[PDB]
Enzyme design. Structure first.
Site, PDB file in Angstrom:
ATOM      1  N   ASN A  69       0.815  -1.200   0.000  1.00  0.00           N
ATOM      2  CA  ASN A  69       0.000   0.000   0.000  1.00  0.00           C
ATOM      3  C   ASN A  69       0.863   1.271   0.000  1.00  0.00           C
ATOM      4  OD1 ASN A  69      -2.689   0.966  -0.292  1.00  0.00           O
ATOM      5  ND2 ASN A  69      -2.642   1.691   1.833  1.00  0.00           N
ATOM      6  N   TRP A  70       2.122   1.121  -0.399  1.00  0.00           N
ATOM      7  CA  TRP A  70       3.036   2.242  -0.553  1.00  0.00           C
ATOM      8  C   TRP A  70       2.430   3.190  -1.595  1.00  0.00           C
ATOM      9  CZ3 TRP A  70       6.376   4.770  -3.944  1.00  0.00           C
ATOM     10  CH2 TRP A  70       7.483   5.412  -3.390  1.00  0.00           C
TER      11      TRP A  70
END
Length: 284
Positions: A235-236
């Protein structure tokens, strides 16, 4: 943002795939309808390469950010700059032609995105149009919505032709019971064999502090049921986080959620074989 640290333990296997991230290059403005870019620094290829080196990620799926609405320029340019390791998930809709689809495929596109929550470019009402094209191209579709509405969407989700993935642990913002109709419906969808479940962004839906026991409870059940249908992502660059103080440690977060899988074989599947199947990547 934190871009270095101690490696995940156990270490990622060669070929590990981050299935959930966004990337940003200069010269690609946000479009009306979305949230605007991440205020800075712009999280680009250089920063993400550092993250890859830290975590032992070998392959990345770069997904269209809400910031860019239906303009795929940035995402495709990020994939090209990242090279062999990267593939794209982009926006298509009813205006997208067969020729358009081949252009996108040649440029490393492996799927299309539905985002029914605020800021999303294409919501669930366009599912059939996205799905018909994705299926025709042998792509997958990433589907994100408020999971507490799963029962309302069930008839349409049953009709999905394509391979698809249910984003971000289902975003069941209010939780779900591990033995209620929601879980029953979800497991039946998985049983058909065209649905994967994503372990990414747990903190966007958990109402608990670490170790996010609410989301763990139902995520363990789903992974135990279908270990060949879990995928993982960072989820960067964690766009929902605004202060250095609240920014997660990506290696620890990985160990935590991979720890919810039933065993080591399932962890290898989640990182390598399962994303290879979902996105149809060459085997490592």
């Amino acid at each position: 943002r934190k871009l270095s640290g101690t490696a995940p333990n156990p270490a990622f296997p060669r070929g590990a795939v981050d299935t959930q991230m966004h990337m940003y290059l200069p010269g690609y403005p946000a479009l009306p309808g979305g949230p605007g870019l991440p205020p800075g620094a712009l999280p680009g290829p250089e920063d993400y390469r550092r993250l890859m080196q830290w975590l032992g990620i070998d392959r990345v799926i770069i997904t269209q950010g809400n910031a860019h609405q239906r303009d795929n320029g940035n995402t495709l340019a990020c994939v090209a700059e990242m090279g062999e390791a990267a593939h794209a998930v982009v926006i298509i809709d009813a205006t997208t032609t067969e020729k358009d689809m081949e252009k996108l495929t040649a440029a490393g596109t492996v799927g299309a995105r539905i985002m029914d929550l605020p800021g999303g470019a294409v919501n669930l009402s366009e599912l059939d149009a996205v799905d018909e094209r994705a299926h025709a191209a042998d792509w997958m579709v990433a589907v994100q919505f408020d999971g507490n509405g799963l029962l309302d969407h069930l008839p349409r989700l049953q009709k999905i032709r394509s391979r698809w993935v249910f984003d971000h642990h289902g975003k069941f913002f209010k939780g779900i019971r591990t033995d209620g109709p929601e879980m029953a419906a979800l497991l039946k969808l998985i049983d058909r064999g065209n649905l994967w479940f994503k372990f990414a962004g747990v903190y966007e839906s958990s109402r608990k502090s670490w170790p996010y026991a609410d989301v763990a409870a139902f995520s363990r059940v789903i992974a135990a049921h279908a270990p060949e249908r879990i995928v993982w992502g960072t989820n960067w660059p964690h766009n929902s986080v605004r202060e250095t103080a609240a920014y997660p440690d990506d290696a620890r977060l990985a160990e935590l959620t991979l720890g919810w899988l039933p065993d080591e074989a399932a962890r290898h599947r989640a990182l390598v074989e399962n994303p290879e199947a979902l996105f149809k990547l060459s085997p490592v």
